[PDB]
Amino acid sequence: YRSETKRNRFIVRLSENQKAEDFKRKEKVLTVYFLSTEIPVWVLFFALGVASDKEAVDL
Amino acid sequence: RKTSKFMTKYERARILGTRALQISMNAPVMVELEGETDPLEIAMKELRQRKIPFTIRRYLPDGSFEEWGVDELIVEDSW
Amino acid sequence: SGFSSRSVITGDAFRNVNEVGIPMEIAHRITFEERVSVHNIGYLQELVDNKMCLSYTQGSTTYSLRDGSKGHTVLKPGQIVHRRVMDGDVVFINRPPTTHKHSLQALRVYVHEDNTVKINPLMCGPLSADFDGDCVHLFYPQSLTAKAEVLELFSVDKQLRSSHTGQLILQLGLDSLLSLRVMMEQVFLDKASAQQLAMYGSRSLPSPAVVKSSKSGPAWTFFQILQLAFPERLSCRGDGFIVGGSDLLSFDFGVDALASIINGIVTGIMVEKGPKEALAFFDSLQPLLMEHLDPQGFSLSLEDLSMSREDMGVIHNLIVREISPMVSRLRLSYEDELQLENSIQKVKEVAANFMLKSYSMRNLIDIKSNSAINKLVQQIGFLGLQLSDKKKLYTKTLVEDMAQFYKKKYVSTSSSGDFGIVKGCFFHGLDPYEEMAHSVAAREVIVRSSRGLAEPGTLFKNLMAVLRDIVITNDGTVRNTCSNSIVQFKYELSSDNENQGLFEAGDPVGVLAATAMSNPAYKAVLDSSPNSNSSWELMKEVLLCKVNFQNTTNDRRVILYLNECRCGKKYCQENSAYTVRNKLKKVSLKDTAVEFLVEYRKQQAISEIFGMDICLHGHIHLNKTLLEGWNISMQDILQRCEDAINSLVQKKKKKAEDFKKMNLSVSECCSFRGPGSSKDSDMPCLMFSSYNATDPDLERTLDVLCNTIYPVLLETVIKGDPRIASANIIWNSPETTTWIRSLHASRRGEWVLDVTVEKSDVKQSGDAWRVVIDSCLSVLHLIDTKRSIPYSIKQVQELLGLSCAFEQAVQRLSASVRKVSKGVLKEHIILVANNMTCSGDMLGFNSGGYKASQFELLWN
Amino acid sequence: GVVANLGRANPLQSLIDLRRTRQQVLYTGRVGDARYPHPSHWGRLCFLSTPDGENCGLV
Amino acid sequence: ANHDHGRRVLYQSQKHCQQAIGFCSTNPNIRCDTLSQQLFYPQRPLFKTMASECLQKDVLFNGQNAIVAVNVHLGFNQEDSIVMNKASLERGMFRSEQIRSYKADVDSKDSEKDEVVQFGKTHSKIGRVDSLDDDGFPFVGANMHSGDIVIGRCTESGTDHSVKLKHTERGIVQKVVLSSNDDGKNYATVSLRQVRSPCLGDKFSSMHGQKGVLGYIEEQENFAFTNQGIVPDIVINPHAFPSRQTPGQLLEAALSKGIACPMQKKKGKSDAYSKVTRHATPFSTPSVDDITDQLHRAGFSRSGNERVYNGRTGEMMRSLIFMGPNFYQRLIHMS
Amino acid sequence: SKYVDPSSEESHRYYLARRNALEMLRDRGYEVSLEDINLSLQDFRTVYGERPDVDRLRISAHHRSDSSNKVKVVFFGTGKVKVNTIRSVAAEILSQETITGLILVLQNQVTDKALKAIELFTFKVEIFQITDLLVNLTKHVLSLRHRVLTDGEKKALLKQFNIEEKQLPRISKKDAVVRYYGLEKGQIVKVSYRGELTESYVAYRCVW
Ligand SMILES: [Mg+2]
Ligand SMILES: [Zn+2]
């Protein structure tokens, strides 16, 4: 999600596993958000007030 | 002996230079002419009928050399 | 030496070959010095009393011109005279070095107005120019030694044979050869045209061939017209020409070989009477032709470019007969692009066959050449294949959405034909889609022939750093000058008998070989045609080799020949072709799988182990048809999995899989697939267990340890050698159109195995072929050694020795440099190869390979 | 690669000089199709005329 | 334009159209720039295209309608070289006219905001001052030579800082312009004028990327002439067409030759000038049958050719010659 | 063509290696019979073990040039070589009147025990790998019949063109023909080529 103005804007990256020893499953990390500060996706779900799971799967 | 009884192009290109330079530097003519006033044209004729007094010294790569008179070598042009 | 020139060049046919026209704008500003002698003063005082002279600077250094009315002042013999540029002088012509093609010529000066340079049209070859605005530099020999060596070395008759090919540097050009063709098709001349043409050359005129008939008067043939350019008393024997006593006795029919039979006669004249009679032949022949074309004319028409309509219907019935059903196979087949081009040129030849049935088109184009016979089908026939994915500069995405963009009234109206095929021609016009496709093709050719091109530029310096200091010494030993070591004992073959016309001692033959090898590089790069781009890297494989083993993919291929006939078993050859592939072609486990299911249930009672160490049971289901297709059993899978998982925990790896189960491959487990797949248990093999964590405490943290051995189960091999990357059975056509072989003359159809090893090739060179031979042990009887070399020519030097690689480098450079320039003296090839193979093994001509006269003096 | 001089030799050189658009040079490692007519040029840009040389197909 | 090879159209539409000599401006008294150029008699083409008709700018075409015959000359039109006609050159055809401007400057009047190089004469005869006036500049009818003084920018006592001509600039003075800036920075502008006819080294081109150099200027009575007495203005070599793949030039010549000719059998049954094609629009072009049937209606031969007689021997040349008008162009950087 | 394909595969790797080494000593001009090199592989594997054969009397190829030039080999079927193996197989076998031995390495040999292999006085040794010897490079179509020159013809070559030893077109001492015939620095070889370009060309090389 680019924005020419407002130079604090973010991307969601799914093809990084943080390690490659045997193999890990591809999990989504909402990577760098304020030119630093990676977060996983679900903390930023429940920070924005998702009630439970199975609605985030339906979102 | 052993050293290529013809003449190189590179040796013609120096002997005609020195010959015509000395002829343009007050040397006597040695052939009969027909009014030619170009020193290369002059220097061509005594080569054409074997009348030049030079000694060509062919070096060798090992260290020795040769001795040859320009009358000896065949600048023939026959075909 | 005059240091500069800025002038366009132009042409002039009626002025001699080694003559050049100077503008008076610059001819009156260039000086030739000259020494006042005892001889020259009767000429110099004529030059100095009037104008056409300059400052009379002697040792007193008087810079007074010929302008202040000083008069004669008859000079001292000994002074030096600056004058202007008269006729008959010598100049030295060149351009800025776009290439070091031998543009060095010596020419005679004529001074005129009209500020261009006028050369003969025969100097468009040697000076490498056309007449659309080229700029040349001129240089002046000022010293007398300069004039001496320039006139002696660099004149046209001195350089009449090419020092890079061995042929004549002067051949009949554009209009002259047309004049000869139309003079051949009109064999008889009248009296008046004959006597008019007789004014030009020499030899007055022979008696008429036909001296009378019933109707006309006398009649001449045109061979008698050709006699007029000859020198006196010529006697030479030829393939079609017979010359006895300055007459042309017989001349062969062949109009197709006409630029050779003329080229035979000039070579015979140069053999018999020298070069200064060959130039007289040219200077008497060229205006004799250009005046013969003057009262006839020659032109084009619109009916020449118009192919007939029923023949147009013939050629349009071949795009959708053998080209649309072939592009129906191009849907899945990739690498038949040379089969593609074979069918295309089969169409292009019969297309070009029709438009030579006109009088004007036979005579403006060279019929034989492939270069300009398809260009004319691109403007009377059709263009052809404008798009492919193998024109490797635009990516595959452009091809896929240009294929998609065929929705632009091509799917809305049609599906016939295909994208990338143009059924139309330049003469009848291109509707906008195929115009866009032609634009991407022409754009790609511009980008390819525009970019880069400094690789021959750096290759010239990388050939000049090492091949510079090599001459022919006074005894004939070709030696490095700075080391005095024999690189080659004797030059050109059979030139030790005393017959001259050949190389001499002093010739810098390495600098000859550098330029004579650098010119085909530019002729291959600046033309982006496919035969000129396929052969550009065949020089780079040989000349740009690196001695330090980089372990590239050219360093891994091995070709395998298999010739054990039996004579008459009828497809024993092709059965031999594929079983040796079957022993070596690699198949794995990760390819034939479909899914992977771990499950605590369904084997609770099958878990009979007294302490219950067994809970999880990971199925790995296969697909039946591929396991039943290539004749792969199920118990050998158990064999190859169990011994591998044993022999890799015996390796110092871990203690994570010591208690592996690897039960059995059953081909029918159960009515499984709770999560929806709905199949009926078709090869659900390898139903293992992982009880390493005995009494498994946590279910989820033990399931991840059943997902650290699923990869090492996937990555195993089943049937084939683990070291083989691929193996391919190809090329049922051994003729001379394909790559370099060791033998093939006998058969015409032999199958081969292109075999590639993966990266287990250690830093030792020559190990890929070592592994392939150490692989085929069970099948050595039907593979054919004494042949089957490795591919890269450094590895052949590693295997068979240096002197085999010498002949292979010779043949590869030969077959490479033929395909772009069509003729090159073999002695430069042999000299380059011996300079590679002198100090031990093959040292290349690059930055890595780099990391490892004086003959006389005059007396009197 | 922005504001230039205005040609005046023709009155057509000024028209050509006032109607031009330019792709920058980002990095020469696989620019891709950045100098080849893409089927989205249909009717908007020109698929026959372009400069040749240092910026063939970028202007 | 969809008949030519794409490389030729790239040539024509990027370089040769941008260089051709033609219109310049309609107020040349104010444009003080280096090397303004202009023809005498600019023209429009005989044909029509769609965009040139909707735009209605005849300044999109900079050249003249030459008559081109493809034939072998004596060997002067080889290697992409062209041959003109001297009689056509003497009636004004392709005659151009260039104007170059020479510029200098000095400080305000007296301020720093000696090194005062005030524009003057400096009568002590430094160089050549035959044409300069007292102000430091020449007059408005002068005939400035190969190397003169063009602006007298000399100080009061020291040596000259004056601008001088180099080796290759000369010409009649057209105007003198003297302006300034806010801080008095006085500016000087002198424009010279020249008239050039095309010489034996100049370059020309067609509408199809087919360029050459004028290599041979021929007198009128030696060209091949038709039975009407028509002579070509430019003669080119037939070895240029089967390789470079431009049939659009031959089709253009046939179209324009079918436009400009009269139309016989005009008495009754028609006004006889209404079924005439003038539109060579690029992607929608007339067919071969339209052009050849128009040439049949105009009286000429259907194949495009035309019978000529020689200008030297005077008898019938055996090969029929292809003639017809074509819009050619004259390019800058003459030599 | 037809194909059978059973093999005790390890014995094939010694059949080909032994037959190549006996062909090499045959072309070095030693006393070796016809039938010992021209046996088949079937009657090879019968008499010499079908699968197993190590330290066998097959290795006892040991012959004379004409009178007293003695060359024998020692095959190593191992997967690791140290100093103890080679000393235990050489310190007993040099008392069988030999002057040159050969080494047939199978796994690898390291430079960590190289000086103890070139310490051997008056007894030069040559090495190989088993995996190189599975073919005949001399029987290949693209191999060239070398002809070694004598010392007198070497001096006549150096004196003919008045040329020093170190000026010749060289050849490395690791070439597949140099190591094959057992050649030495200084010795001059002569090659006659054949090809469409290089047919009548000849070339001289000495070893450096
Ligand atoms: Mg030119
Ligand atoms: Zn299963």
Side-chain angles (χ1 to χ4, degrees), chain F residues 26 31 37 47-48 53 73 80 89 94 107 114-115 119 127 135 138 155 174 197 201 207:
Chain F
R26 183 179 62 84
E31 293 179 356
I37 67 170
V47 69
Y48 288 151
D53 43 355
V73 299
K80 182 68 175 179
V89 302
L94 87 165
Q107 179 67 257
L115 292 174
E119 59 89 18
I127 63 172
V135 298
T138 62
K155 187 184 286 183
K174 294 298 292 182
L197 271 69
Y201 182 75
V207 182

Side-chain angles (χ1 to χ4, degrees), chain C residues 9 129-134:
Chain C
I9 76 166
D130 50 352
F131 292 153
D132 58 353
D134 296 332

Side-chain angles (χ1 to χ4, degrees), chain C residues 164 463 467 508-518 827-829 831-832:
Chain C
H164 292 164
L463 283 170
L467 279 166
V509 296
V511 190
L512 293 178
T515 61
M517 199 64 68
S518 179
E827 289 84 358
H828 298 290
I829 296 173
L831 183 66
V832 167

